[model samples]
Target: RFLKVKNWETDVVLTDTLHLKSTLETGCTEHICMGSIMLPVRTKDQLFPLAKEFLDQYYSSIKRFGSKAHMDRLEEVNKEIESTSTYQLKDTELIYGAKHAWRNASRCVGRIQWSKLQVFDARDCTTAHGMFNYICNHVKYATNKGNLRSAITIFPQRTDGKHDFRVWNSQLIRYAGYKQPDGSTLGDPANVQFTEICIQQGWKAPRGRFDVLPLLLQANGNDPELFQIPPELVLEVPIRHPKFDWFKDLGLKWYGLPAVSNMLLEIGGLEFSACPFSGWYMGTEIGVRDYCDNSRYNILEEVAKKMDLDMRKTSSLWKDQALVEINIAVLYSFQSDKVTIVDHHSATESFIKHMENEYRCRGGCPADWVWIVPPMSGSITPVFHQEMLNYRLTPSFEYQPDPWNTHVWKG
Candidate 1:
C-alpha cells in the first residue's frame, strides 16, 4: 500500500523504514544512496518468508505452480524448515537457483553470460583440505587451457553462519603485491596486505612482481590453512601491444581466470559463503582499471612516458592515447593467445541487447550506473547514456566482510 515497486521510470520509491533498510527504495532519497552495497543476513524467522517466496517463484518458473508435487515439496520444505530451522536445496534446485543468482547480479555488465555458468556443487566438501581439491578442480575447468569458461564452485551453505566455509583469498588467481625495504611496492598494489597476510601465515613468497599467491582456506572459524596453487593450473597472458615493439620490455602479464572468491551467493534465503565464481574478463577490467587505476598498478604515466607523451598538457590527451593502446594490447594479446576476453565496445553493446531482453521479459533491469559504465570511453559506451534502475533482487551475489574479521549480521 505504501509504494508500487515496479513503477520504474515515472515513479520514485519510499516503501517503509524496514524496507528502506533492506535495500528497498534504492536509487533515491536522502544523502545516502544504497545502490551497490547490501546488508548481511538477519534472523531465521524472516528468512522463512523469503524462502517461501523463492519456492513460489521457483515452482512458477517450471510452470508447475499448483501441481501436487509442488505443493507436497513446499509442505515438506516448510516442515523441514520448522523442524530444524533450515532446509537444504535439492541439487536440481541448487542448479536453477545458482543461475538465477548470477542473472540478477545488479552491478555486473556481463550478466549476459549468466546462463553459461557451470555451477559445480562442492557442498559435500567435509574438510579444509577438501576445499583446496574442489577449488583446484574448479580452476582446472574454468581455465580450460586459456579458453576460459564461466564457473562457480560452491562450498557448503552457511547453515550456521559462525562456521561458514571461507576462502581468505579475494581471488582464486591473483598476483601478490609485496613491500620492499625502500617503501616501494612490487606486483599489484591492490593485494599488498593480502600477500602480507599469507606471508604471516608461514607461506613462502617468491617476491616476484607477478607472483600468484597461495590459497588461504578456513572452515568452522578455525585457523586458515594455506595451500599452494598448482602452477600448471594457472593461464597467464603476456600483454603485448600490436605495434609497440618496446611493450614486451614492460614485462606485464595477468592471469586469465578471474575467479572472485570473496563474495557470497544468496539463493532465496540460503547463503553460500564460499562460492568462488569466475567469468571471462572484460578488456577494460585489465587494460583500464587494473593497469591504470591510481590505487592499483598506476602504470599510465610510465606507459605514457614510454610513448613519449607528456602529461604536462591536459589537452594533449596523453592518457586517452595510452589508454586506447593499453586496451588494444589486452584484446590483441588475448586474441593472439585464443584466451577469452571482451572489449568494452562489444561488452556494453551486448549488455544493451541483454538490457532490452530483460526489459521485454521483466520491465526493468537492475544496473548500477557507476559500475555498468566502462572506466574509459564512458560517453561512447551505450550503458553510460542508459537510465538504469538500481534495486535489490533476490538470489544475488552480495559482498561479505573479510574472513579475518568478525562479520556483522544485519538484522
Candidate 2:
C-alpha cells in the first residue's frame, strides 16, 4: 500500500475498508455496565443517564448487585429520577434484559477489547484475560471466517476502483489444470482464485487504491515540499522479484499495478512502522489488540539487516518528524495463513508536558517512519451507516422519554 511519505512508491493503494473499519473504531470500550445508560437519561441533551446514576448511587458498591434494602431503595430512587422527568424508567429486569439482549453486542465489544487486550499487558502490569484471549480469538478468526468476519468486517478496505475489478474477477484466467488419470501437469486451472490484496478506494475518481491525499494536496499547492519524494524512493520496483512473474504472465491483468515491482526498505529515509494504521486518525485503535491484527512485513530481521536498519527507526522519528502536519495510515487483515507506556500524574507528567515536548521538538511537517502502519481514512470521514447502528449505544435512548434516555424528560 502507498504511504504518505515523500516520493514513496507502492504496488497497491489501500482504503475504503468499511468492512473491517468498525473493529478499529470504539473497540476498546470496557466496563459497559447498565449504569452507563444514566448519563443519557439524565442529561438535558438526551444522552443516557445510566452512566451518571452508576457513579452517583452505586459507583463504590464493589458488589455489582445490591441487597433487598438497597434494591428496594434503588427502585424507589429510580422511580423518583424517572418521575421527576417526563419519561418512565424500564424495570430493572427490562434494563438487565436489554443488557442481556445486548450481550452479543457487548461480547463483540468485549472481544474487540479483549483482542487488543495486549496493550494493557505491555509490561509492569498484570491481567489474566488479556493476551490469551487475543491469541485464541485470533486463531479462531483465521480458522472460521463466518464467526468473526460476520460481526467485524475484518477486511473493510477492499475497494480498488480500476483494474481490481478486473483483477479480482474470475474467468480472467484461462486453461484448466487437471490430472490426466496419471500424474502430469495440466496447464492452468479453470477456476481462478483472485486473492491479490490492494487498498480499498479513495481517490477523486476512485481509480486507484492509493490514498489520493498526497497527490491531491500536491495539486492544491499545500506544503509543496511534502510532495517531493527522496531520490532513493524513486528506485522502488513494482513487483517484488522479477522471477515471480507467473501471475502477471498467466493471470488476468489487474489495474493499479505499480510500474516498478520492488519494495523499498524505507521511504525518504524513514522506516515504516510495524503498526500499519498508526498515522491516521481512524487507525488509532489497532494497537489495542494484537490478536485481531496482522502485519504486512515479516522476517523483518533479514530485511532490516540488508537495509542496515534498526528496529527502533520508527520510534526514532520523535525528534525530527514529531510535529506532523500531514498524516496517514494503511490497514490490512487476512485470516495464519492469515496474513498477518505511561505513568505519573504530575504536571510534568501530564499530557500537556508531552504535547509541549512534541511541539518543542517537532514543528509539524511530514516525516517518514517506515514499518509503521498508516491510519484508515474513516477516522476523518463521517461514520458509515452500518457502523452507526453497530457500535453506538445512544440510539437505544433516542425516542425514550426517561430522563436517562431523553433530555425532554430531564428536568
- Cα RMSD for candidates in order: 4.8, 24.8
TM-score of each: 0.91, 0.18
What is the model-wide C-alpha lDDT for candidate 1?
Answer: 0.82
- Residues 1-411, model 2: lDDT tens digits: 221211122122122222221221332246653322422212323312443343233322334455665566556644654455322222342223222222213212111121121111111112222222322333243224212221110111111111010011121111222324564323222211111111112212222221111110101111111121122221111212122323122222111101110111111111111000000012122211111122311122332343344457677542122111111111111111121111111211232222223223422111111111223222222111111122322101111111111112111
Overall lDDT per candidate, in order of appearance: 0.82, 0.21
Error of 1 at 300 (Å): 1.1
Clashes of each: 0, 70
User: For model 1, how does the per-residue alpha-carbon lDDT over 1-411 read when each residue is reduced to its tens digit?
Assistant: 232233233343222221231433454567777555545134668777878778877888788999997889888888888888888888878888888878777789999887788989998987779999999999999889888889999888887676788998999989999988998889999999999999998989999999999999986556778999899988999989999988988999988989889998888688898998999999999999999888888788889999999789979999889988889898999999999999998999899778767765655566678789898999788777666666677778888889877643322
**Candidate 1 minimal-lDDT segment of 10 residues:** 12-21
Candidate 2, residue 178: how far the Cα is off, in Å: 40
Error of 2 at 336 (Å): 8.4
Model 2 poorest ten-residue lDDT run: 272-281
Which residue pairs come into collision in candidate 1? none
Candidate No. with top lDDT: 1
| lDDT (Cα, 0-100) at 240 in candidate 2 | 25
